[PDB]
Structure 1
């Protein structure tokens, strides 16, 4: 509907032919995030959707509160297609604010709890957001206005600044709803319109526009490969604003099948063990550093963790020995997940042998996912060859939002997203992530982002550049189309200019 305006505002859409294929093969469906919630309330009304301390929401209550909060937002002047920044810890009112935004067609911009005002400020400008919503776990935290008082330049267009303090009951956390009669809220957005912006995972974060249809599709596929059912009890320890926690399979997957999410503000081992034993949790998603915390907690022996069935681990390199240790100590099926907020997610399978779950990051979600392992010159590589992992598919973005200069470098000519990861596809077509394309260079004690230097060098006539380190020292491989490179760089951080520099191939 609004795709005309969005394209003019920075959105890069799916190419018309690919979009039609994802329609006809039954990937993209016709439900927005909020219409999906309305149908979950239709099917699972009185089931508990979310639990946090002494607070809980059934699917019915979540729908009502969301409707009530959307009506509030509308009354305060928030409108459809507006971007609203959302920053929140792992608190239960976050689910009311997310679907409240979806109820009026507003678009969340999911900000990790922890991003300072320096990040919020750039995120707010790049997205042209009109609102900042900051959920706080306590009253001693910085409010939305507090963060905005730290901007380096005023942001007049960000006029909605509101903080929710999570309290001992939902009703007390949301007093602004008292003077509001719930509406009959009609959003005009279609499932192929932009639902939200995510942030990528170095420097200033880039905005990732995801549509309803493409995100709900990835969630449905993750629901299948994680094997979620309406009896699934999932512990949420990762930050709720993170793509992994949201959808892989995340809390939305649990909502999708009518299960129960159990929300912990804390990752501390004892707290999580207590919750697992108390609620008989069957699944949890972790990153390797949380798994290490857990496998080395002396509290381990002290709790009944027998209900545990499946542990997702993703987000960073998982050493096979630590994957092995997770299976043994916790006595679960390990499910490795190699995903990115930009799109593609890969899962190992529940019927995969332990060895597969120990050695690989599994298989793409969709049969329409395309994974290219590219050599240094862009050419596709065969099975068991390490190279640059690039991808394109029915839920993978085609451009970062309102970032045309970065987009020209982050996607191939034919539209493959360049993950920055290296690895290979093995005999079973399981992907194995071995490392990063450009690790940061450690020159005389300082850390430098190679892509940060390539970008400036691309503005020289530069046709291709790859910056790497030898000896600790910074070298710039150039493809045509030293003193002058550095001179030009000083023209625009001294400790980053190359120490040596022009070949034809190997980028």
Structure 2
């Protein structure tokens, strides 16, 4: 008891049998048979593509890859900005159990190399604007046998398109509607290899088995935790396909037969006009697009009467920004949640209606969550703050070729340890403790760490900084920082302290001093890791 474990309710829609490829194949085939059902719409070029087109090409890419030689022992990379084509090789691979590692058109060569060094792909699908970078990475990773151009019909600079590639390898009388996807073990066959960003150091490869997608397809249909399947539902999605939010909303939308309208370059008017003209029900935004829309004054120009929901997925939002965005859009609130790459998608989610101010949401079906004491690891009770831990069928199988990082994160009982601080209240709402609102407190007077961090990031020789409060006794807290120097530059602690003092009131002085590090510790979300910053400076002095 262990009435202190917060458990998700029963799913509205049971977990269905099959691989992710099989459930996607089955749903999309039914939508393919209704002419004119729109799967994806490109807001920039205004072209629609139907489920019939989308199913037939994905089916053909699956068989073409199968005949080329790929099976559950291979991985592909899809390297492209959001596009009408992005999900064709993705769906094709899932149909035959080939693992997919997404990457973006505009990631630098260094980022692509490390990502694809982890995923080690036999075949790369790339858009025209990513070709040169994939070529340059290929000469450094010779497991890359074949490059296929996504946004072309003819061959392109000697390389095959998806359309000519399919034609080289399909059997003579191939029938898209007789194809059957590979059956295989959903628990161990890897569906996605997602990149991590995440904590400190190099991005890791998060391996996600087909099961996580299949569980997510239950969430997508849920009237409480996902989207109610009404006909002519359209989503305006402005989030990258190659992070969890965009990858797994989209796969779920395809299961549901929805129209997915895409924007890959954000523009204010195009966004608002697309909400209006496409009669969008739900919009997906990256967190800093929420702050953008808190400032927009054009929203009242548009007829947004069909708009029911703006969502941020796994990213928590401050109460201030969310309320402001809800108010600008005349919504009762916004849909928030908390998830990690390592959880596939959001595992805490705002329940429909059941929103509470400042809450991030509630535990999703199939999941349980707890908070634990940061010293004993013992499960805490109501309204007590500890580390958030979660357990469920959407947790990754692990990091690709790094069981050390895996076992350090997931315990012997399957609890993932988030590194983030949370509590739950009496109604089972969760709250994520935001580092930015934890004020440092010096003889009465409080300072936001991000204020000082901003002062420090201003200096030409300071590359990165993390500010937290050093416990003192005399004092309460002394503001103190870990500082990452810019390559080449030399600074002393007294130099940095003198610089801050010359920019802040005397209460906000950096009396705790400075500890030079190589990197500011970050959590799995990418936000600064205050607890570890504090540890570093305690150990130092």
Question: TM-score with structure 2 length normalisation?
Answer: 0.71
Instruction: Determine the structure 1 residue equivalent to 2:38.
Output: 48
Instruction: Determine the structure 1 residue equivalent to 2:383.
Output: 384
Contact map agreement 2:21 2:94 (CA 8 A) in 1: yes
**Aligned-pair distance for 1:124?**
2.2
Distance 1:167 1:384, change over 3 A: farther
Contact map agreement 1:31 1:212 (CA 8 A) in 2: no
**Aligned to 1:335, what secondary structure does the other structure show?**
coil
Instruction: Determine the structure 1 residue equivalent to 2:107.
Output: 115
**Aligned-pair distance for 1:27?**
6.2
Q: Which moved more, 1:235-244 or 1:212-221?
A: 212-221
**Aligned-pair distance for 1:319?**
1.6
**Aligned to 2:289, what secondary structure does the other structure show?**
helix
Contact map agreement 2:22 2:183 (CA 8 A) in 1: no
Larger Rg: 2
| Distance in 2 separating the partners of 1:73 and 1:272 | 36
Summarize deviations over 1:448-468 as a string: whole Å, max 9, x none. Answer: 799xxxxxxxxxxxxxxxxxx
| Distance in 2 separating the partners of 1:411 and 1:328 | 39
Aligned pair partner of 1:105 in 97, 105, 125: 97
Aligned pair partner of 1:212 in 203, 210, 213: 210
**Aligned-pair distance for 1:48?**
1.7
Summarize deviations over 1:320-378 as a string: whole Å, max 9, x none. Answer: 1211112211122421121112115211111214xx1x311111112542333342342
**Aligned-pair distance for 1:301?**
3.0
Instruction: Determine the structure 2 residue equivalent to 1:461.
Output: none
Contact map agreement 1:369 1:393 (CA 8 A) in 2: yes
Distance 1:190 1:26, change over 3 A: farther
Distance 1:75 1:367, change over 3 A: closer
1:393 equivalent in alignment to 2:410: no
**Aligned to 2:130, what secondary structure does the other structure show?**
coil
Instruction: Determine the structure 2 residue equivalent to 1:242.
Output: 243
Summarize deviations over 1:210-249 as a string: whole Å, max 9, x none. Answer: 22222211231243123331422111110112211222xx
Summarize deviations over 1:151-186 as a string: whole Å, max 9, x none. Answer: 7x8222222333323689xx9984444555463365
| Distance in 1 separating the partners of 2:324 and 2:52 | 40
Aligned pair partner of 1:86 in 59, 65, 78: 78
Instruction: Determine the structure 2 residue equivalent to 1:481.
Output: none
| Distance in 2 separating the partners of 1:159 and 1:48 | 34
Instruction: Determine the structure 2 residue equivalent to 1:195.
Output: 191
Summarize deviations over 1:39-83 as a string: whole Å, max 9, x none. Answer: 213432322222223432322221111112223333444333311
| Distance in 1 separating the partners of 2:538 and 2:326 | 47
Q: Which moved more, 1:391-400 or 1:268-277?
A: 391-400
Q: Which moved more, 1:274-283 or 1:289-298?
A: 289-298
**Aligned to 1:472, what secondary structure does the other structure show?**
strand
Aligned length: 431
**Aligned to 2:92, what secondary structure does the other structure show?**
helix
Contact map agreement 1:392 1:416 (CA 8 A) in 2: yes
Map residues 114-153 of structure 1 onto 2, 5 A cutoff: 114-135=106-127, 139=128, 141-143=129-131, 145-150=132-137
Contact map agreement 2:211 2:393 (CA 8 A) in 1: no
Summarize deviations over 1:451-496 as a string: whole Å, max 9, x none. Answer: xxxxxxxxxxxxxxxxxx963258xxxxxxxxxxxxxxxxxx9844
Gaps of 5+ in 1: 1-24, 451-468, 475-492, 503-507
Aligned pair partner of 1:447 in 441, 464, 469: 464
| Distance in 2 separating the partners of 1:269 and 1:167 | 32
Instruction: Determine the structure 2 residue equivalent to 1:501.
Output: 539
Contact map agreement 1:348 1:363 (CA 8 A) in 2: yes
Contact map agreement 1:266 1:272 (CA 8 A) in 2: no
**Aligned-pair distance for 1:413?**
4.4
RMSD (Å) for aligned C-alpha atoms: 3.5
| Distance in 1 separating the partners of 2:68 and 2:30 | 32
Distance 1:436 1:206, change over 3 A: farther
Summarize deviations over 1:406-453 as a string: whole Å, max 9, x none. Answer: 123222343321212112112211111113699999798343799xxx
| Distance in 1 separating the partners of 2:336 and 2:143 | 42
Summarize deviations over 1:258-297 as a string: whole Å, max 9, x none. Answer: 1211112222121111111111000012233112223323
Distance 1:90 1:118, change over 3 A: same
**Aligned-pair distance for 1:99?**
0.9
Contact map agreement 1:68 1:181 (CA 8 A) in 2: yes
**Aligned-pair distance for 1:94?**
0.9
**Aligned to 2:240, what secondary structure does the other structure show?**
coil
**Aligned to 1:342, what secondary structure does the other structure show?**
helix
Map residues 469-484 of structure 1 onto 2, 5 A cutoff: 471-473=480-482
Aligned pair partner of 1:221 in 195, 219, 222: 219
Contact map agreement 1:49 1:260 (CA 8 A) in 2: yes
| Distance in 2 separating the partners of 1:172 and 1:188 | 27
Contact map agreement 1:112 1:242 (CA 8 A) in 2: no
Contact map agreement 2:482 2:516 (CA 8 A) in 1: no
Contact map agreement 1:30 1:213 (CA 8 A) in 2: no
